[PDB]
Design an enzyme around this catalytic site. Structure first.
Site, PDB file in Angstrom:
ATOM      1  CB  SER A 201      25.681  35.871 -47.354  1.00 15.46           C
ATOM      2  OG  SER A 201      26.476  34.795 -47.802  1.00 15.46           O
TER       3      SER A 201
ATOM      4  CG  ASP B 276      20.952  28.941 -48.388  1.00 13.07           C
ATOM      5  OD1 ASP B 276      21.846  28.650 -49.213  1.00 13.07           O
ATOM      6  OD2 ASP B 276      21.002  29.936 -47.637  1.00 13.07           O
TER       7      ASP B 276
ATOM      8  CG  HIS C 207      22.608  32.182 -50.129  1.00 12.60           C
ATOM      9  ND1 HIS C 207      22.810  31.776 -48.827  1.00 12.60           N
ATOM     10  CD2 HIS C 207      23.532  33.141 -50.375  1.00 12.60           C
ATOM     11  CE1 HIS C 207      23.810  32.463 -48.307  1.00 12.60           C
ATOM     12  NE2 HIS C 207      24.265  33.299 -49.225  1.00 12.60           N
TER      13      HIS C 207
END
Ligand SMILES: [Mg+2]
Ligand SMILES: [Mn+2]
Length: 254
Positions: free
Chosen positions: A102, A207, A235
């Site tokens: 991320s 995601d 995610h």
């Protein structure tokens, strides 16, 4: 067996975790509000300790790298990228590979572009090189921690305590939000062409926080990069599909 400790880097005492004896050093970079303790449990325990020496750091203001408290200036991603490489240098590694999740993947893209001689390879997932209206909206739906699933909130509320947790989450939305007002909603589109190391971009097709177009854009501009899609991944795919992800990263790093 994992050791936790702090090391002085750029005016802050950064916390990190280390395990393994291998000659291939790897840094695990956590996402927003993340830490080695909450974002990389499966990696710190399962990644090959013979092949690698694994370190999971806590960005300033995140995890146990407090003080200081977290703030989000215009260059906060570049500041984290500098701290990340200075931390590994502080720990005497001469070169390292990066696993960035991320916001941690954004940071890793930046580090590779700014310190190419120090980075060997990299695996990133869930990163976005810019902010769009769709992203802006997604982030707004994430703002209030109270609206988070009790599961996703428990570990972070426990780590920081509600107040800091909810508040930092607010400043993050405001922090990641500031980029929409720059040309091209840019965070690091200009640094992708400067990434010179082999890169593997993994993306979970389900995601919900990062639209697949961000993974396609990064694949497009990071020369020689490979893009791997996981049909059922979301995610947090390295946690939900730890064994599958771990093999993917380990095969790529060797
Ligand atoms: Mg443009
Ligand atoms: Mn920590």
């Amino acid at each position: 067996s994992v050791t936790s400790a702090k090391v002085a880097v750029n005016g802050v005492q950064l916390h990190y975790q280390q395990t393994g004896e291998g000659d291939h050093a790897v840094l695990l970079l956590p996402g927003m509000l993340g830490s080695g303790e909450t974002d990389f449990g499966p990696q710190l325990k399962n990644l090959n300790k013979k092949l690698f020496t694994v370190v999971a750091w806590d960005p300033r203001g995140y995890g146990h790298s407090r003080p200081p408290d977290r703030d989000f200036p215009a260059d906060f991603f570049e500041r984290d990228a500098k701290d990340a490489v200075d931390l590994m240098k502080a720990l005497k590694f001469k070169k390292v590979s990066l696993l960035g999740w991320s916001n941690g993947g954004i940071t890793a893209l930046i580090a590779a572009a700014k310190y190419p001689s120090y980075i060997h390879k990299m695996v990133i997932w869930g990163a976005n090189a810019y902010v769009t209206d769709e992203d802006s909206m997604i982030y707004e739906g994430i703002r209030d921690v109270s609206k988070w699933s009790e599961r996703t909130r428990k570990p972070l509320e426990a780590l920081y305590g509600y107040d800091y947790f909810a508040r930092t989450c607010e400043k993050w939305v405001d922090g990641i939000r500031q980029f929409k007002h720059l040309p091209d909603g840019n965070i690091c589109r200009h640094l992708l062409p400067r990434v010179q190391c082999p890169a593997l971009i993994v993306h979970g097709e389900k995601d919900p926080l990062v639209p697949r177009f961000h993974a396609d854009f990064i694949h497009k501009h990071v020369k020689g990069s490979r893009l791997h899609l996981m049909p059922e991944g979301k995610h947090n795919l390295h946690l939900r599909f730890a064994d599958e992800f771990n093999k993917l990263a380990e095969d790529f790093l060797q």
